[PDB]
């Protein structure tokens, strides 16, 4: 039976009054028939006697005052497990791919407590991604978090598509993709790319699109986290992709403004860092399993300082910064090797070989940055006989960091490549140590592995 009644509707915010025995608890889910169509409300606050303020998880239009409301006695809980692989779902765990009922065996509440510091295990198994620059310059372990920073159009979304494909095809690992505030065009591109590449049956997709109320865009990250945690508890090593943290923080700002809370530093909700900590602290490698994470984070207006990216940094273990200048010169992935960083790039974890190669590359490029302006003002024929060699090797290193992706084949028609870490170190060390001073620069552009550079030079 239904035991509550709506008493206000103001935009997305609905007030419901219950008899003072049956007041729902916070985060409980209610249900009401908005016309011929069901609508569920998530309780945000218990205020006053009997009344409860909620955020509608759907279209608020068409609600009358006095509609009967039935309170589900559990939070929003979603299907989990193997049944969800290859499906698309909204924040409520309903299928939006038209392939019909999910076939769940179990449902979990999306609100749960983070693992205790007692239950964590530190591990240093480095993920191998298959991307030269990310493997060399920004290694990250299982259970870590990686942030892809940059403006718009630099390549965060296709870098995440490529990571998904590599992990799913080369390592057969399960993945979850939480499209917080997704653009429906990009969600359809992503779906068709994953089904074409034949990885879809190892990825479960959750979409809270932009055209939806704030609560959907806010709780989609928790739905994706809950599916990832169900896989973890099975003892697997899942990898959780969050398509934009910045839109998670904007959805939080919207929700906080609607509830009428007093705003904070730049219009951000007062609870910004606590929402971010509730999210980011469930992503960890427990003793039973692991959740790794890759997270795109838009930096608005390049400033790196407004509260959203400023508060995400406290949680990341590695950061890859993408620049549009590098992208415009055409060298995708467009990763900047001098600003990207990792907490795991030290000899005790990556070994002296990898650490030395990475610092060598950084040193060569940092010196080429010095030489660029002498080349500009005095011309190159004035450089030393050692400096001209540094210039040639820096330019070759700079070419060799680019790579053709398997998912970029739709953009350029060139076939993609997967490059192991062993070949990455071997190639960059060979370049730095003069073993390839006889090849032209363009033999390294979009090449893949180092043997393919010698195979390409013959064609030039």
């Amino acid at each position: 039976m239904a035991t509550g009644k709506i008493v206000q509707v103001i935009g997305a915010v609905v007030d419901v009054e219950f008899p003072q025995d049956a007041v729902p608890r916070v985060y409980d889910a209610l249900e009401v028939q908005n016309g011929n169509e069901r609508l569920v409300l998530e309780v945000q606050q218990q205020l006053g006697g009997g009344i409860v303020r909620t955020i509608a998880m759907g279209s608020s239009d068409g609600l009358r005052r006095g509609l009967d409301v039935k309170d589900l006695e559990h939070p929003i809980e979603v299907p989990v497990g193997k049944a969800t692989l290859g499906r698309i779902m909204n924040v409520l765990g309903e299928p939006v791919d038209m392939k019909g009922e999910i076939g769940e065996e179990e449902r979990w509440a999306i609100h749960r407590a983070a693992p205790s510091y007692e239950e964590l295990s530190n591990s240093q198994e480095l993920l191998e991604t298959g991307i030269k620059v990310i493997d060399l310059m920004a290694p990250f372990a299982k259970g870590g978090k990686v942030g892809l920073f940059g403006g718009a159009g630099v390549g965060k979304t296709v870098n995440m598509m490529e990571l998904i494909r590599n992990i799913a095809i080369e390592h057969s690992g399960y993945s979850v993709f939480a499209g917080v505030g997704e653009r429906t065009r990009e969600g359809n591109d992503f779906y068709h790319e994953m089904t074409d590449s034949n990885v879809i049956d190892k990825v479960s997709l959750v979409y809270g699109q932009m055209n939806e109320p704030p609560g959907n865009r806010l709780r989609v990250a928790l739905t994706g986290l809950t599916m990832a945690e169900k896989f973890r508890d099975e003892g697997r090593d899942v990898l959780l992709f969050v398509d934009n943290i910045y839109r998670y923080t904007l959805a939080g700002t919207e929700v906080s403004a609607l509830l009428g809370r007093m705003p904070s530093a730049v219009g951000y909700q007062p609870t910004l860092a606590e929402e971010m900590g509730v999210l980011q602290e469930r992503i960890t490698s427990t003793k039973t399993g692991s959740i790794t994470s890759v997270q795109a984070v838009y930096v608005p207006a390049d400033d790196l300082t407004d509260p959203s990216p400023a508060t995400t940094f406290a949680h990341l273990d590695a950061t890859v910064v993408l620049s549009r200048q590098i992208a415009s010169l055409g060298i995708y992935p467009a990763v900047d090797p001098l600003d990207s960083t990792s907490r795991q790039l030290d000899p005790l974890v990556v070994g002296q070989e990898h650490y030395d190669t990475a610092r060598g590359v950084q040193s060569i490029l940092q010196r080429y940055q010095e030489l660029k302006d002498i080349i500009a003002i005095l011309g190159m024929d004035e450089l030393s006989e050692e400096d001209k060699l540094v210039v040639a090797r820096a330019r070759k290193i700079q070419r060799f960091l680019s790579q053709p992706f398997f998912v970029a084949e739709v953009f350029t028609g060139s076939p993609g490549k997967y490059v192991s870490l062993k070949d990455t170190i071997r190639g960059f060390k060979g370049i730095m140590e003069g073993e390839y001073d006889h090849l032209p620069e363009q033999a390294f552009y979009m090449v893949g592995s180092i043997e393919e550079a010698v195979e390409k030079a013959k064609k030039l």
Binding site: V9, D61, V96, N188, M210, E254, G260, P263, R324, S328
Partner: protein
């Protein structure tokens, strides 16, 4: 301690009988009138978004359903209203005339003809507020929509189904670019819609006169919400325009919608929110101003042929539909951080940045290529343009990297001076006069001339006369090749050889 519409005689009614009979949940009475917002007492069965009918033939939108009050906004002149007037709740939501017969008409946000040419010939009514097609009903955008501007069509392509923001400070050509994008469709098979928010009427009359001079007006719908019209009719106008574009989208045709200054719909909605006492956010804007624009712009979609068959109940088979949006935003002092630009830059698939320094320095259209982006990219280009723009991107990128030395250029080495004075020439090449749209053949021809070094010896002052002479020369001698490129966009060794020959023979025999 302040009252909430507890007033003497309403209280006395309850003293007489507290549990008043359920006389009519269908109707109520106005208790307040101010600034275009009325508070209604009663209407127990009002629904959010519902149209409420006032004396005369006027309506209001119920936006606040509270404990003993409905806050509704009048969609028209409100000063005639007075306390105590009776009012009824229609079961309806706002709908607008829709159909093919609107092409070439001027209508207000309610679809009433306002040009004075007589009654509309609509094909039925469509709800103003509608949900966009889901994820599974889309199709990837891979068809070009041509603006005719060398700066845009080469480096910031727009594809059928995209949403490209035009953003810049006042008086930089935001409207000129958008209306040249409409004129160019005069014979493209794309229907156009131009919705003007908060503009003064004698500007709309002027752009309609320009659309009429060129052949464009017979192909476009103009939706007008002038500065004097109430806030509700300005805030709802973009949805009225999108509902008319969806008529074509949903039936296997292509449309292009240009929302003029959505930064003036946000201000109308801010007024409506602040009058309804809703919690102010940043810059006093309401909380859900992101959700205002998001559900507007997510309607511009390309839908697959199966959705079109299901919608038209089998009447149209095998055709995709499309609706393209070009919202306009105005940024005060180049501040893209403000609450409204920082949302719409995040919703859209691209951004065209118009800068006043380029506009003053003579670069028109004043597009800034180093900061504009189109996420669809080369997929929305004919392959000839995709091939030829790759060199323009880098020609300008290296120039932006070298620009600092332009003020010390005497000191530079000749190896870089060639890059710098090539970047200056390709930057001079993208300038273009207003109302002079270029067919893809002409754009590709000029960009080929630039890329393959044929401008290496033309002095910077003459680039424009070179371009004009080249296009005139080509229009008489090689009309068949232009007629081929315009029709197919292909690019082969043959096309490249023919273009090389055109450029060689022109630069040999003609003069500029």
């Amino acid at each position: 301690q302040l009252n909430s519409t507890e007033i003497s005689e309403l209280i006395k009614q309850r003293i007489a009988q507290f549990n008043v009979v359920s006389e009519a949940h269908n109707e109520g009475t106005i208790v307040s009138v101010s600034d275009g917002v009325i508070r209604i007492h009663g209407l127990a069965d009002c629904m959010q978004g519902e149209m409420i009918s006032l004396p005369g033939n006027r309506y209001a939108i119920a936006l606040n359903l509270e404990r003993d009050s409905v806050g509704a906004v009048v969609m028209g002149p409100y000063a005639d209203l007075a306390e105590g007037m009776k009012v009824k709740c229609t079961g309806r939501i706002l709908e607008v005339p829709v159909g093919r017969g609107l092409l070439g008409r001027v209508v207000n946000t309610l679809g009433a003809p306002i040009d004075g040419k007589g009654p509309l010939d609509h094909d039925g009514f469509s709800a103003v507020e509608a949900i966009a097609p889901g994820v599974i009903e889309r199709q990837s955008v891979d068809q070009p929509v041509q603006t005719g501007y060398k700066a845009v069509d080469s480096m910031i392509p727009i594809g059928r189904g995209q949403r490209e923001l035009i953003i810049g400070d006042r008086q930089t050509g935001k409207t000129a670019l958008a209306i040249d994008a409409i004129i160019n469709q005069r014979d493209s098979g794309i229907k156009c819609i131009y919705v003007a928010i908060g503009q003064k009427a004698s500007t709309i009359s002027n752009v309609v006169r320009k659309l009429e001079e060129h052949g464009a007006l017979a192909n476009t719908i103009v939706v007008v919400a002038t500065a004097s019209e109430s806030a509700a009719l300005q805030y709802l106008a973009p949805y009225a325009g999108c509902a008319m574009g969806e008529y074509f989208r949903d039936r296997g045709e292509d449309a292009l919608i240009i929302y003029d200054d959505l930064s003036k719909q946000a201000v109308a909605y801010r007024q409506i929110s602040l009058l309804l006492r809703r919690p102010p956010g940043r810059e006093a804007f309401p909380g859900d101003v992101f959700y205002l624009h998001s559900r507007l712009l997510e309607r511009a979609a390309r839908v697959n042929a199966e959705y079109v068959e299901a919608f038209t109940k089998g009447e149209v088979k095998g055709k995709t539909g499309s609706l393209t949006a070009l919202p306009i935003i105005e940024t005060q002092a180049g501040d893209v951080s403000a609450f409204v630009p920082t949302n719409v830059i995040s919703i859209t698939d691209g951004q065209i940045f118009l800068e006043t320094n380029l506009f003053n320095a003579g670069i028109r259209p004043a597009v800034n290529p180093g900061i504009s982006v189109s996420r669809v990219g080369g997929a929305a280009q004919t392959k000839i343009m995709k091939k030829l723009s790759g060199g323009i991107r880098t020609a300008l990128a290296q120039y932006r990297e070298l620009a600092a030395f332009s003020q010390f250029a005497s000191d530079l080495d000749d190896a870089t001076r060639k890059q710098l004075d090539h970047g200056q020439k390709v930057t001079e090449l993208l300038k273009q006069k207003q109302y002079a749209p270029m067919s893809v053949a002409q754009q590709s021809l000029v960009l080929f001339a630039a890329e393959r070094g044929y401008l290496a010896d033309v002095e910077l002052s003459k680039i424009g006369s070179f371009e004009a002479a080249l296009l005139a020369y080509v229009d008489r001698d090689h009309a068949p090749l232009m007629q081929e490129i315009n029709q197919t966009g292909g690019y082969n060794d043959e096309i490249e050889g023919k273009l090389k020959g055109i450029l060689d023979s022109f630069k040999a025999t003609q003069s500029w």
